[PDB]
């Protein structure tokens, strides 16, 4: 049984998305849909997911850009891991 979230994608671009747009980025299983990524993220960090953009990477993986609701704070979420 493959899991959805593989690990946080942490790079300069990710940090900006986190500080400026309340977005979190993850390396996820390429078989995962935007919806499955949303659910997984909410169930793992107890947050509300507003939008999910995806991209199949030239590393053979899928990257997800998850925007959280204004109710949540990406910076704080990512900081506890």
């Amino acid at each position: 049984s493959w899991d959805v979230i593989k690990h946080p994608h942490v790079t300069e671009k990710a940090m900006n998305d986190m500080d400026f747009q309340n977005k979190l980025q993850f390396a996820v299983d390429d078989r995962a849909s935007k919806g499955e990524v949303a659910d997984a993220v909410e169930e793992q960090y107890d947050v509300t997911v507003e939008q999910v953009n995806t991209q199949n990477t030239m590393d053979g993986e899928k990257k997800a850009v998850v925007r959280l609701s204004e109710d949540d704070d990406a910076q704080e979420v990512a900081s506890r891991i």
Binding site: D30, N56, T57, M58, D59, G60
Partner: protein
């Protein structure tokens, strides 16, 4: 061209294999990446 998801996975792998033999392997084996490819000089499959 237009790459499918699988084609893309294969290209990605080829790119990964194009890295070098890590430094530590040198010390450990007390002393080359034979599959070193170049985008221009070589030709991948498909």
């Amino acid at each position: 061209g237009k790459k499918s998801k699988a084609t893309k996975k294969r290209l990605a792998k080829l790119d990964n294999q194009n890295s070098r033999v890590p430094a530590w392997v040198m010390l450990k084996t007390d002393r080359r990446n034979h599959k070193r490819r170049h985008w221009r000089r070589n030709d991948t499959d498909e």
